[PDB]
């Protein structure tokens, strides 16, 4: 409940993690840098989204080269550049899942060790409405939560190559 994992998650909530509302509902979204952010492809964003309740025009959208979609928003604010934290070193890592959508606002779940199975799998009974949650640890952003099987959750892996 404390330690640097919690501080990292809270700072991400402060600067980079938002609620993105599409016609399919509320999802957690991750700002990467500039005006680029990421959401689950299942969210099916249109030409406008709500970013923490504010209507924002989508300048561009595209799927990645895995259930993740990149949006460039028509927004004033820039995201803190968190690309340096994107990591694929996840073994031996007790991770947190940070969600900010639906009733799970400012929510930091400690999901335990994570492994590849390919997606990242973590043993924690996930509820619905947490899609888009950021899988991370201190100084490390691993992926975006895109589903579960009722006893495990699964995250699509983030990679530095996706963002030039």
């Amino acid at each position, epitope marked *: 409940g404390s330690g640097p994992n919690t*501080e*990292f998650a809270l700072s991400l909530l402060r600067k980079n993690i938002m609620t993105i509302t599409t016609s399919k509902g509320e999802f957690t979204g991750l700002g990467i840098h500039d005006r680029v952010c990421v959401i689950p492809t299942h969210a099916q964003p249109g030409d406008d989204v709500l970013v923490n309740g504010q209507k924002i025009r989508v300048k561009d959208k595209y799927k990645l080269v895995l259930e993740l979609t990149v949006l460039t928003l028509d927004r004033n604010e820039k995201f803190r550049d968190i690309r340096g934290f994107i990591s694929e070193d996840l073994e031996g890592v007790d991770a947190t899942l940070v969600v900010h959508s639906n009733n799970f606002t400012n929510t930091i779940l400690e999901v335990g060790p994570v492994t590849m199975a390919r997606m990242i799998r973590y043993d924690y009974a996930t509820k619905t409405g947490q899609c888009g949650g950021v899988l991370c640890a201190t100084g490390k952003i691993f992926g975006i939560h895109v589903g579960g099987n009722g006893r495990q959750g699964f995250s699509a892996q983030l990679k530095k190559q996706y963002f030039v």
Partner: antibody
Amino acid sequence: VQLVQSGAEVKQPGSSVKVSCKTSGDIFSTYGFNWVRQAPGQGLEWMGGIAPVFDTLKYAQRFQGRLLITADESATSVYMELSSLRSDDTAVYYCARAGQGGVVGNYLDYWGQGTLVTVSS
Amino acid sequence: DIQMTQSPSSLSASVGDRVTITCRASQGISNYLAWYQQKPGKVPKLLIYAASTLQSGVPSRFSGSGSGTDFTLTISSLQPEDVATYYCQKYNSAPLTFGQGTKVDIK
């Protein structure tokens, strides 16, 4: 990893001192940094910290109200400014990197060389 | 505030001796504890974090143990280069409080 601090300072009571700490630029934009001081012959004392990537600021209660910690990206440096100097502020001031990245609150894995501040009286 | 206290505060031992230093936190800090070594006239240096994880490069004669409130740093065979002051520090959350330090000398 390199943390290069500014040079020795001599100050009178009631004034203020600013100490700088320079790092590479990759490190500045990803890590947190802490200020720790050490009076002559005494122990280490945590003063505060900043993670520039997230504007995370933390201050020790003992210095709250007379300590300002800042960052400049162009200079890739973090700073501490201590005001209302008293002679018990005579100490070596250390800049130190918090480990792993993105946080102030962590173990400190690299230390700058230290800056002696002498407050006369 | 919060207290980090070490025991003993100083000791003198012989080369080859087993040396044990303890640290007590007034509040539980789980395993968010680091140990630092400050050799005379040098800057402090990280020896151990997460209470028992050796920083890379640190000799294996240094070991740490404990969780919660009671922690121990052990030097299994005291070497001349180990003369120093050793500090514990919590980082469960701010403040990142240091213990008062334990001065280790050799007769």
